[PDB]
Amino acid sequence: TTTVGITLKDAVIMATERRVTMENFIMHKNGKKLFQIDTYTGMTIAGLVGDAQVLVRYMKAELELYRLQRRVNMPIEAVATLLSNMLNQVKYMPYMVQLLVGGIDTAPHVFSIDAAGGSVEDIYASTGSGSPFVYGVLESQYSEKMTVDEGVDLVIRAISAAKQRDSASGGMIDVAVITRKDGYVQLPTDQIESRIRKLGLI
Amino acid sequence: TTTVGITLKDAVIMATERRVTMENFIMHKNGKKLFQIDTYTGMTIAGLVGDAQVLVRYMKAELELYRLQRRVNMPIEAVATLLSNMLNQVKYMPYMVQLLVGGIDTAPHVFSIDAAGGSVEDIYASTGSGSPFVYGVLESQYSEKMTVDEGVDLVIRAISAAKQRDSASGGMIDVAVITRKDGYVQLPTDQIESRIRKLGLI
Amino acid sequence: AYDRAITVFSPDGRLFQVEYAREAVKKGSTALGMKFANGVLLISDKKVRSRLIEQNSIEKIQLIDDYVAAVTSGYVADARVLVDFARISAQQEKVTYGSLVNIENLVKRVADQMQQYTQYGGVRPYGVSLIFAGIDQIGPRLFDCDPAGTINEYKATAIGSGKDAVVSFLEREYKENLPEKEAVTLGIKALKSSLEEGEELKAPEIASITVGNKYRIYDQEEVKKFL
Amino acid sequence: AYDRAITVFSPDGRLFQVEYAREAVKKGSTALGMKFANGVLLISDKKVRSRLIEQNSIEKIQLIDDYVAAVTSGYVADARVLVDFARISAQQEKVTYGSLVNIENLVKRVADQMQQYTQYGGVRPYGVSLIFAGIDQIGPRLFDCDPAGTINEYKATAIGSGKDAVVSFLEREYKENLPEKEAVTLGIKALKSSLEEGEELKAPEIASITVGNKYRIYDQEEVKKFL
Amino acid sequence: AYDRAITVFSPDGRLFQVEYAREAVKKGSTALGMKFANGVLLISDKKVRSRLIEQNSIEKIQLIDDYVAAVTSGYVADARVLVDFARISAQQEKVTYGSLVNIENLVKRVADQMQQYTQYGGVRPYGVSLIFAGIDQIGPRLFDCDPAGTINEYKATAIGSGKDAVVSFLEREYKENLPEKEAVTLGIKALKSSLEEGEELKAPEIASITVGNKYRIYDQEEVKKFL
Amino acid sequence: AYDRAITVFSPDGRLFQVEYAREAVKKGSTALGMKFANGVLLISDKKVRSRLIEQNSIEKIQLIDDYVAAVTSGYVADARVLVDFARISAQQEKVTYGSLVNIENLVKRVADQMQQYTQYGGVRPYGVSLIFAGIDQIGPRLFDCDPAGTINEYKATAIGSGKDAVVSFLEREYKENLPEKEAVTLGIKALKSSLEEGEELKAPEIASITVGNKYRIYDQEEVKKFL
Amino acid sequence: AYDRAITVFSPDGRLFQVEYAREAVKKGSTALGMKFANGVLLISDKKVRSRLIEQNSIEKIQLIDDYVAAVTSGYVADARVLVDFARISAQQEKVTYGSLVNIENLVKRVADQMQQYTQYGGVRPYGVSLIFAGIDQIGPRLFDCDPAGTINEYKATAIGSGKDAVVSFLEREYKENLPEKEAVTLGIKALKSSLEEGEELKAPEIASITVGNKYRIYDQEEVKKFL
Amino acid sequence: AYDRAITVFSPDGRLFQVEYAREAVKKGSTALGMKFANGVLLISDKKVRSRLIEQNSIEKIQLIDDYVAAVTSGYVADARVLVDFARISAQQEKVTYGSLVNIENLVKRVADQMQQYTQYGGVRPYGVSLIFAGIDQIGPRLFDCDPAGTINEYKATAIGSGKDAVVSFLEREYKENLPEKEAVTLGIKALKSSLEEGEELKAPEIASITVGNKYRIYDQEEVKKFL
Amino acid sequence: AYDRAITVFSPDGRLFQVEYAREAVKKGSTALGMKFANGVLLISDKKVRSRLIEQNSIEKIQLIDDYVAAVTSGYVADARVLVDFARISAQQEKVTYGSLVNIENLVKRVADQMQQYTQYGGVRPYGVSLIFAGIDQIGPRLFDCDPAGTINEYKATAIGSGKDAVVSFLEREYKENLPEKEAVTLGIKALKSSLEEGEELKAPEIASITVGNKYRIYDQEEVKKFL
Structure with missing residues (x-):
């Protein structure tokens, strides 16, 4: 499991992967770990799936x-x-x-x-x-002056590095961008797939 | 984690560092450990972050x-x-x-x-x-006759020594001065940064 | 008949015990509050009944917190209980969320407490009217509460025996976005207009708050240079 | 006699306290709701009693969630309690099942709460009438609730003092599957037909929802270009 | 006297509040049920009061489960509470034993609940009459329940305002082991015989069940080709 | 006065509500029981009110267990509750001790339950009279229970409206240690002697038990060859 | 007035409900007890009302344990409850201490139970009078208990309708330290002296106990050779 | 009116039920207590009503412990409950602290128990007056308790019907620091002065205690040589 | 009407039971308290009713702690309960915070306890008036409490029957910052001015406290040299 969240000048970028291990071994490749809980609020979950899903429903109601x-x-x-x-x-x-x-x-x-x-x-x-x-990638490449497009590339690269080295992580990368002008926007899978080709992370 | 509090003739000086360890490793460099809880009262927290933050909110309400x-x-x-x-x-x-x-x-x-x-x-x-x-520094240098300015220098030196020898401590130093004439005053970061240069603690 | 206990409706649909509790409000002291430019103020009349009373416990403006104040009319013992409930309710919100965002929700919790005392048998309703004023995330607010539990927002309002006289005056002279000095002057004039022909106004208590700052209680000398 | 407490039947089989609570409903504000093509709308009359009241707290349409709205008549303090109960009940269903499939069940839970206050001694019934409207899995819905707890579904309905006048108008002019613009125009005409001879309609609040979208509250200017 | 609360016996030994609750039943809608060859059917009268009511929420036959249905008369809000109690009670038996063997025990649990509301002070009795019909291990069953809690089994029975007219008709024309088509035809004739001289029968709801199958609700067109 | 609630003594020392509950017993069906040679029998009158009632649910003899039976008079809903209490109480004794040794203790537990409803306020007494018969370790037993809770043992007894007529007949013709055939014949004659001049006896239910065997319910044909 | 519920004092300081419960005692059966040489005896009158009653359940002397017996007058259902309470209370003392040393404490526990039913609202007092007799560590004892809870010790006492007649006879003929045969003979004569002029004494029940032995119930033949 | 239940104040501010409980005290037996040199004594009148009563259970002086005694007047059943409460309360203090230092606190606990029965609805007040006497760490003490709960300390006091006659005598003849023999002689004379003209004093019970020793109950012969 | 139980408002908005409890206060003993230079004193009138009462239990000034004292008027049994509540409440604050900073909060806790007894049914209000005096962190304080729960601070105040006479005297002669000797002299003169024409003042109890020291109770000789 790998989740990341970064702040920019007027934006918040959050991204996770999708691999879920249950009863050991990779039993789900397309799990959901990034949730929208308000108009301009998102949450990512790591740990036990059962406890995390209960908390997400609680926060949405509250x-x-x-x-x-x-x-x-x-x-x-x-x-x-x-x-x-x-x-x-x-x-x-x-x-x-x-x-x-x-x-x-x-x-x-x-x-x-x-x-x-x-x-x-x-x-x-x-x-x-x-x-x-992920922290290694962010320690050497993150800058508070990046644009939204540059910030999206950074989190994709950071998670891609984690997928290469962490066996518990894998699957397709989900990315959400939060701004006041657009609200909570989840980036389409086709755009992220295009980004990885352009970035060189295969 | 390193917190210190000293008494003077008509003043109280409290200072902490900012390093927070969570899930092992340094995951936050700018944590908050010094809180104002009343007009002329401050509190510092060491130990588990979750328990400490709950107590701070309790004391503020009470x-x-x-x-x-x-x-x-x-x-x-x-x-x-x-x-x-x-x-x-x-x-x-x-x-x-x-x-x-x-x-x-x-x-x-x-x-x-x-x-x-x-x-x-x-x-x-x-x-x-x-x-x-910190106790080693205070045992050999503290005096009840120091001025407020001298007392601020002492706590900065004491915490700086702890940062050199304790891996769990680090980050920027926060200092608060409490007097009846000025109330609870948190020293600006620029002043403390100037003090460390003048003191020689790099 | 239909006038004893609350859990009786009258044939035409009134709660007489609630109405009778409104009569106790009409015998309380007169207080008022007004909105002004980036702020809200509270004015409460303080009359003296004897020179043997310590002037300081006559505090008629109670601070719920550093940014919310309240004034009450009716039974003082019932009012004190409600003020204590509001203070505890305000601190519970601060513990849960770390801040108080909307004053209206704090007023609603107080109003809910009074509403249950008009529907459940074995108790009598509170004979108290309240005015809430303060600054929250949305801005200056001004609320009223009645024994039944009705809540309204106002640019200016009054409670007590002289409520009709003060409200009628504000119905004709009130203006929005006034300076604090002008608004306090208008408030004193409105309150004076209610005194029984002959009686002279005596130094009242005035509390005002502006956006960014905390509540400020007027000193007795500053109040004096307004009459 | 048989008119005091609820847990008495009248010799001919009526609950007078429930009937007396219906009289309190007849003294409330007039509101109405209509079904139109792929949607449902809510209209509530807002009259002004003074220029000192902040126009915004007069919110008469309360959103239970992003897809369900309610309007109430009668005692405002009792109505506020029921609205809060509905909001908590709606969130409990979302927590349990992950979604809200049928609005009728949410209305039934509210009606069950009011029914128990007409059968168990020691309490009085709620003097509140409610209208529920929204979109669920089956489509647009429109419900009413009375102090006893009776529930009915409607293509168009009204509550309050002018309920008879509005319903009679809808009994003669209402048509199904109208456009939202036409339905709001008919609603304003129906509500106008109830005003006491002489009084002029004042800007009301209109809320409408269509399948696929969320509830939309009409701005004061958009309401103005309907009168 | 002896007519207010239940926990008073009359000098000659009657519970007036129970009797007064029976008067509320006489003001409800008229419904009936009949046994036929290997099955049982339920018929409930549905009259229209306005064209603004959505015809579908007028469901007067409530399915307790896939094999038990009920029809009620009297206070609709009290009836809805009892129907919900029956549904939960039916599912509890299925959880405990894996099946429902005797419908009579389910009816007895409902009747026990209503009986306690005629013996314990602080509550009023339910003003509801119920008819239960379905298929169990012993075969087709037909039961009634009254506000006191009396239970009887019938080959044919009716409840509501027109109960006397329908029962008198069945007292003279009812025959056992009829085909479902014939039994429904007799039921419509029995129900028609109760309409106030002049009024015309309007499309009612008919539900029937046969041994081996589940309950089937008649479509509006199939009901139409019976009048 | 002294006739409303139970927890009032009359000036001369009577509980009127208990007496009023006895009047409800006098309006119930007539039943009787007799001791015979090594056994005891129960006879209950079953009258028909309509041909639309399923003859089988008219079971007036309820088996508490395989060796104890009961018959009730008065309010059928109150009687059903007491019968269920007796059945659970009988099984509790079997669980605790592995057997039921004395029927009298089971009757006392039922009587204690009815006694508490004549001493504690907030409830009304049961309007039920009961007769218990069966075989225990000491032999055939026959008991009665009244709304107050009085218990007596009898060689022969009757309850209901025709209790006086049946008891008077048994006061003159009853003999001990009769054969079961003779005892049933005497019982039918005793019950017949109570029918209002003109009315004809209709097939009743007869249940008898002998030492060593279990309870046996008479089939309708075997009952027929006794009239 | 002051005669309904217990928790009212009369203006002159009487509890009318307690007094009214004493009237119910005066309608009970007559019983008596006497002390004799190294022992105490109990005599209770048994009248027959019908030949259909099993003579054996007329047991009027109840053994609390092997060494304590009791006789009651008034409401038999209330008396049975108190006797069961005494039996459980006696066994609790034996479990705690291994023996029963003073009978007076057992009587006090029974009297405390009846006292609380004259001071706490929501209940009525017991309409029962009791006599306790037995052997404890101090010797033969004889006690009485009234509905209020008053306790006295006696050499000889009586309860019931004929209490005045028996007590007056014992006031004149009673002697201490008599042989058991003589004491029983005096007791029968005392009881006979109360029978309404004309009525003949019928075989009563006599129970006696001597120091060292257990309680002995007189057989019907041994009772017969005393009349 | 204002005389039924306690939780009503009279318009002029009296609790009638408390006053009515005082009337029951005036009908009790007469008792008195006096302080003497290094000690305190208790005297209670014992009249005989019949020769059939065992003289020994007439114990009117109850020992709370080896150093505290009490005498009661009014309802004996209520008095017995209060005496048991005092005994348990005394032992609780000994368990907690290892000793009893002040008798006044034990009396206050008893008085608090009686006070709550005059303020909380659903109960009636105790109709008992008590006198407490004994030796504690401060010395000889003498207290009284009334149904309301009032406590006073006395050099000499009396309760009961003859309270006025005894107190008036002590108002004129009482002297402090008398020898025990002289004080008992004065007490008998004071008690004699209350007997209805004609009646003769009968052997009463006298209990006295001196500093250092325990309570001593006078034997009947020692009492005899005082009359 | 509106005068029985508290949870009724009068049509004009008064609680009659609270007012009736005020009448009981007017029948209590007269007490007063005054502020002087760096201190506060308490004076309570002690009249003698008999020479048989131990003079020492007439303590009318109760020390809540070493720095707070109280005096009460009205029902002594109700007053004793409130004094015990204040003592426990004072110790709870000391346990929680290590000290007592403001006396006013201790008085408010007592007043809250009395307020709940005027709003919740089933209880009657306390018929007690209290005066609190002592030294806290802010300085000398003087408070009063009424049966309703009203709290005021005073430079000088009085309670009891002679409250009007004492207050009127203090309204004319009271001066601030007097020496303790002068203030006690003025207090005695004020209290004397209330005695019914003819009656002579008798040695009262005086308690005073100064900043830095603890409470000091005047000895009887020191009180004597003030009259």
Whole structure:
């Protein structure tokens, strides 16, 4: 499993792979690990599939209910704070998950939350078994001045490196771009396939 | 993790570093470990991030509610006593934290509280994996007669020594100064950066 | 008949106990609030009944937090209970989400608490009217709450015995986006217009808040240079 | 007699407290909903009582979710409680099954909650009438709910004080599968026909939804070019 | 006196609130059921009150499962609650034993629920009459339930306002082991005989089940070619 | 006065609600039981009210187990609840001890349940009279139970509307240690003696048990050759 | 007034419901107990109402254990509940301490149970009077209990309708330390003196116990040779 | 009116049910207690109503422990419950602290229990007056308790019907620091002064305690040589 | 009407039961408290009703802790319960925070407890008025509490029957920042001015506290040299 989320000047880019291991061995090649949970909020999931899917449904209900009562979207920091409280409340019977939350309320944010509810903001973050390989790519190539197109290429390259070195990761790459002007936009598979050919990652 | 709090004639100085380790390895370089919880009260956190962040939110709510009903700030000793009761009540399912509370009600105080709720006042105290290196610096250089400017230099030097010897500590140094005349003042990053150049700690 | 306990509807469809609780509101002190340019203010009348009372516990503007204030009319003991409920409710939201985004939801939680006391037998309704004012993510807000639980938003409103006199004055002289100095002056004039022919206005309490800052309680001398 | 508490039947078999709660509905604001070609719309009358009220909190169409809306009449405090119950009930279904397939079941859960308040002593019934409209897997739906808990489906219906006048107009002029523009025009005419001889219609709130899309709330200018 | 709450006996030994709940049944719609050769059928009258009502939610025959159906009279909101209770009770038996062997036990569980609401204070009895029909291990069954909780088995029975007229007709013309076509024809004639002199029968709903098969709901066209 | 709820004593020391529940018993069907040589029998009158009722659900003798039977009079819905309680109570004793030694203790548990409904407020007493008969370790037994909870043992007894007529007949003609054929013949004669002048006896249900064997329900043909 | 529920004091300080429960005691059967030389005996009157009642269930002396017996008057259903409570209470003491040392404490536990039913609302008091007799570590004991819960110790006492007649006789003829044969003879004479002029005494039940031995129930023949 | 249940205040501010419970106290037996030199004594009147009552259960002085005694007036069944509560409360203090330091706190716990029965609905107040006497760490103590829960300390006090006569006598003849022999003689004279003109004093029960020793109950012969 | 239970509003909006509880306060003993230079004092009138009462239990000033004292008027049994609640509440704050910073919050907790007894059915309000005085972090404080739960701060105040007479005297003669000797002298004069024409003042209890020190109770001799 490899998930990545980065921040740009007015954009948030999130991308994951699709390989799912269940009862050992590769039993699913096209799993879903990137979810839209609000108008300008996305979440990626790593860890146990059962716990992660339950949390995704919980956040979708809470954020939609919050929107109807407050007539405004939940701020990204409030989204991470709410998740932090839920995970810490059952820390001794915990969800075995690692989560990334990203979006734009007035500025782009990416939050990393662990199983015990520890939440911390960062310009970029990666989770899963393939994350350390991604951090190597981001440490040497990430720049806050990149354009959206350049940022999409970077996350594709970083995940491609993880797929070469992490056996638990694989499959087709899913990419979502979040901006105020376009909202939550999931990039078509044909565009990403074109990008990998142009980038040289086969 | 390295946090330090010292007392002066009419001031309290608290300072921490920013390195956060999550799922092993350095995944965040600019974490937050120094919080203002009242008009003249600050707290530093060491240990598990999830438990520490929950406690910070609890203290902010309790101290603000106490201020509204009593029309006066909670005394620093009362702040430590309240924290002691909460931690001891769940000592067998405890918060894995070490806390420092400092401030001025009528005199400067610094309190150290452990996971089991043990609270004890001291002129200076340090927590975290880098604390023993800080104690060496304070044992040989601290003086109750220092000025505020000299005290700021001392905590910067003490944390810098811990960063050289403790791999779990690192990042930029955050410093807060508490006085009755100025309240809770967080020193700007540019000033601390200037101080380290003048001090010689690179 | 249909006037004793609440869980009776009247043949024409009224809750008399709720209406009777509204009569207790009409015997409370008169208070008002107005919106002005980038802010909102609260004015409450403070009359003196004896020189043996410590002037300071007459606090009629209660701060729910550093950015929300409330004023009450009716039974003071019932009002104090509701104010404490609002303060705890405000802190619960801050613990859950890290901030308070919409004041209206805090008012709704208070109104829900009063509504259940008009539908479940074994209790009587609160004889309290409330005004909520403050700054949230959407901007300056001004709300009212009644014993039944009705909620409305206002540019200017009043509660208490002199509610009709103050509202009628604001119905004719109120203007939007006024400076804080002008708005307080209009508020004092509106409140004065309610005093029983002969009685003189006595130094009231004024609290105002502007976008970006916290609530500020007027000192007694600053209030004095407005009369 | 047989008119006080609910858990008494009248000798001829009526629940007077339920009937008395229906009288409170007749004193509420008038609202209506109509089905049109591949969609359903909601219209609620908004009258102004003072220029000191912030026009925006007069929201009479509450969105249960992005695809279901509701309008209420009667006691506003009781109505707000029921709307909150519907919103939580809608999210529970989405959590359990991943989607909302039939709106009728959501309405039934609300109606069951109101029914228990007419059979168990110690409480009074809700004095609220509701209209539910939205799009589900079967298509556009339109429902009503009464204080007793009766549920019916309609091509067009109305609630409130002017319910008889609006329904009579729809009994004579309503047509199926109309365009949204035509249906809104008919709705305004139906609502106008209820205004007390002399009173003029004031800008109401209109919300419509079509198959495939989400609910859309009419802007005040778009509403204006319909009168 | 002895007519208010249930937990009072009358001096001559009647429960007036139970009797008053029977009056509410007499104001409900008229429905009937008959046994025929290897099967049982349900007929319920559907009258139209307006052209603005969606004809489909007028479902008066509710399927408890694929082999048991029910029809109700009286308060529709109370009836809906009892139908939901029967559906859950039927599924509990299937979970426990893997099948439903006797319909009578399912009816008894429903009747027990209504009986407790006539003996325990703080609640009012259900104003609902029910007819249960279906196929179980012993064969076709036909049951009735009253607000008190009385249960009887019948070859043919009716409920509602026109219960006396339908029962009197069946008392004279009913025959056993008829073909389904003949039995439905007799049922329509029996129901017609109850219409107030002048009123014309309107397309009702007919549901029948035979041994071996499941319940079948008559389409509106198939119902039409019976009048 | 002293006639509404049970937890009131009358000035002269009677429970009117208990007495009023006895009036409901006097309106029930007439049943009787007699002891004979090494056995006990139960006879219950079954009258027909319509040819549309399935003759089989008119079961008036309920088997508590294979060796204990009961017959009830009064409210059938209350009686069904008590019969179910007796059946569960009988099985609990069998689980605990592996057998049922004394029928009287089973009757006492039923009587205790009815007694608590005459002493605790919020409930009404059961309007049911019961007769218990069967074989236990001590021999054939015959018991009665009343709404208050009084228990007596009898060589012969009757309940229902015709209780006085049957008991008076047994007061004069009953003999002990009769053969089962003779005892059933005497029972039919006793029951016949109660029919309103003119009415003819209709085929009743007879159940008898002898020491060593289980309960046997008379077939309709065997009952016929007794009239 | 002050006569309905218990938790009302009368203006002059009486509990009418407790007094009304005493009237129900005056309608019960007459029983008596006497102390004699190293023992205590119980006598209860048994009248016959019909030859159809099994003579054996008329047991009026209930053994709490092998050394304590009780006799009751008033409502038989309430008395049976209290007797069962005493039996369980007696066994609890034996389990806790291995023996029963003082009978008075067992009587006090029964009296405490009846006292709480005269102070807590929602229940009615027990309409039962009891006499307790037996041998404990201190010797032969004789106690009475009333509906209020009053406890007294006696050398001889009586309960029931004929309590005044029996007590008056014992007030004049009772002697201490009599032989069991003489004491039973005096008891029969005392009981006879209460029979309505004309009625003849019928074989009663006599139970006696002596120090060292257990309770002995008189056989019907041994009772016969005392009249 | 305001005389039925406790949780009603009278318009002039009295609890009538509490006052009515005081009337029941005035019908109890007369008892008194006096302080003397280094000790305190208790005297209770014992009248005989019949020679059939065992003289020993007439114990009117109950020992709470070896150093605290109590005497009660009013309803004996309510008094017995309160005495048992005091005994358990005394042992709880001994378990917690290893000793009993102040008797007043034990009396306060009893008074708190009676106070809650005058403020919470659903119960009636205790109709009992109590006197507590004993030796604690501070010295000899003497307390009274009333149905409301009022507590006072006395050098000498009396309860019961003859309370006024005894108190008036002690108001005139009581002296402090008397010898035990003299104090008992004065107590008998005070009690005698209350007997209805004509009646003769009968052997009462006297209990006294001195500092250092335990409570001593006077033998009947020692009491006799005081009259 | 509207005067029985609390959970009824009067048509003009008063709680009669709360008002009736105020009448019970007017029948209590008269007490007063005054602020002086760096301190606050409490004065309570102690009248003697008999020479048989131990003078020491007449303690009318109860110490909540070493720095807070209270005086009560009205029902002494209700007052004792509230004083115990205050003492436990004070110790809970000390356990939680290590100190007591504001006395007003302790008074508010007591007032909240009394407020809930005027809004929840099934209980009656406390008939107690209280005065709280002491030293906290902000300085000397003086508070009052009423049966409804109203709280006010005062420079000088009085409660009881003579409240009007004492307050009127303080309205005319009270001065701030007086020495303790002068303030006590003024307090005695104020209290004397209330005695019914003819009655003479008797030695009262005086308690005073100064900043830095603890509460000091005046000895009887020191009180004597003030009259």
